[PDB]
Amino acid sequence: KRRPQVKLTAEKLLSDKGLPYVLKNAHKRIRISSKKNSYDNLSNIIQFYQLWAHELFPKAKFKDFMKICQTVGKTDPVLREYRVSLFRDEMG
Amino acid sequence: ELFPPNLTRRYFLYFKPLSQNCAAISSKPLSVRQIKGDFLGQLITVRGIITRVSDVKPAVEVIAYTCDQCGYEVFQEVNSRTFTPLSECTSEECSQNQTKGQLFMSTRASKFSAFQECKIQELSQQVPVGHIPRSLNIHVNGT
DNA sequence: ACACACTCTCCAATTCTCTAA
DNA sequence: TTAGAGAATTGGAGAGTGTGTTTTTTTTTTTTTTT
Ligand SMILES: [Zn+2]
């Protein structure tokens, strides 16, 4: 056979390298200010998400990363279990 | 090995022949006619007059490249008079991330050495009657 | 024989559709 | 309304094939024999 293709998958997201890093650091990473423009602060938010997306899975263009995430995010039950777990933690 | 050892040799090395007063062929001078095909590979001594000298130019020994997408560096070693430069990042990590990145050459981390070429010719008072004088090509590197 | 240009082929990745809980 | 089972369409991996390559002045400085 030819070599099988490599893809983004929920296992990467649920890995310790994955989504927990964002929740462990996002409060410290991003910072808005009224003292800078909308365009300024708006640009700032995307920095962290871009660098994190590269570190996670360098295949593809940033937009493609988001739009790929939509499919697995809506379909996989284990990922959804993790997400309802987050919002239960806030219900705790 | 991570990189070729030639890339970090900061020095040059040369042999100096036997003193004839201690003496072996390397101590005994040959005229440019006596250098037969038997001597290929050996260390010898030659006596004559220099006819022309080239000016110095650089020659590559180890070439260095950068991969754009995965931010990784690779090296190539050159021995022959010509070479083909690399154009694909064959690194295993880069390959397993299916990252078909582009390679670009860099001078700032390549290794060069100084090169010069000359020619030597037999003394006119040693040419046998009715013949035309012969000559040899000399190469020089390093200090 | 050694880099190239071009052709051919198979296989699996993908999205679309139907069914039932 | 979600999701999972089956069918159809497309991409490009990669394997294969054929190919190409070595290789009469006219103007100007200098030596030589000729009138
Ligand atoms: Zn690379």
Question: In whole angstroms, how large is the CA radius of gyration of chain B?
Answer: 23
Instruction: Kindly give the distance from the C-alpha atom of residue B102 to the centroid of ligand 1, in angstroms, as a whole number.
Output: 7
| H or E, element range at B21 | none
Q: Is B99 helix (H, G, I), strand (E, B) or coil?
A: coil
Residue found under tokens 């997201």: A13
Q: Do A58 and B97 touch (CB under 8 A)?
A: yes
Give CA B45 to chain center in angstroms.
19
∠B135-B139-B142 over CA atoms, to 5°?
155
- Spatial CB neighbours of B33, under 8 Å, sequence gap ≥ 6: B122, B134
By C-alpha distance, which of B74, B62, B58, B59 is closest to B5?
A: B62
Q: Is A69 helix (H, G, I), strand (E, B) or coil?
A: helix
- Spatial CB neighbours of B99, under 8 Å, sequence gap ≥ 6: A58, A59, B69, B70, B89
Tokens matching residue A10: 């929920």
**Chain D nucleotides near the protein (CB, 7 A):** 3-4, 13-15
How was this entry determined?
Answer: cryo-EM
- Spatial CB neighbours of B59, under 8 Å, sequence gap ≥ 6: B112, B113, B114, B115, B141
Q: Is B116 helix (H, G, I), strand (E, B) or coil?
A: strand
How far apart are the C-alpha atoms of B117 and B56, rounded to whole Å?
A: 8
Query: Which nucleotide is nearest to B100 if distance is taken from CA to C1'?
Result: D13
Tell me which of A2, A5, A6, A8 to substitute to probe the interface with B (most B C-beta atoms closer than 10 Å): A6
Q: Is the separation of the CB atoms in B122 and B34 below 8 Å?
A: no
Amino acid at A43: S
Round to the nearest angstrom and report the end-to-end CA distance of chain B: 29
Q: A28-55 burial by CB neighbour count: b if 16+ within 10 A, else e?
A: eeeeeeeeeeeeeeeeeeeeebeebbee
Q: Is B60 helix (H, G, I), strand (E, B) or coil?
A: strand
How far apart are the C-alpha atoms of B20 and A71, rounded to whole Å?
A: 85
Residue found under tokens 């090169």: B115
By C-alpha distance, which of A63, A65, A88, A77 is closest to A18?
A: A65
Q: Is B136 helix (H, G, I), strand (E, B) or coil?
A: strand
How far apart are the C-alpha atoms of A82 and A90, rounded to whole Å?
A: 13
Size (chain B), residues? 143
How far apart are the C-alpha atoms of B76 and B110, rounded to whole Å?
A: 9
Residue found under tokens 């004559």: B48
By C-alpha distance, which of B76, B49, B71 is closest to B61?
A: B76
- Rounded, the Å distance between the CA of A50 and C1' of C5 is 40
| H or E, element range at B80 | none
Instruction: Kindly give the distance from the C-alpha atom of residue B78 to the centroid of ligand 1, in angstroms, as a whole number.
Output: 21
Q: Give all strands (DSSP E) within chain B, no chain letters.
A: 49-53, 57-67, 72-77, 103-121, 135-141
Tokens matching residue B36: 């037969």
Surface of A (29-48) touching B: CB under 8 A: none
Handedness of CA B40, B125, B47, B25 (dihedral sign): positive
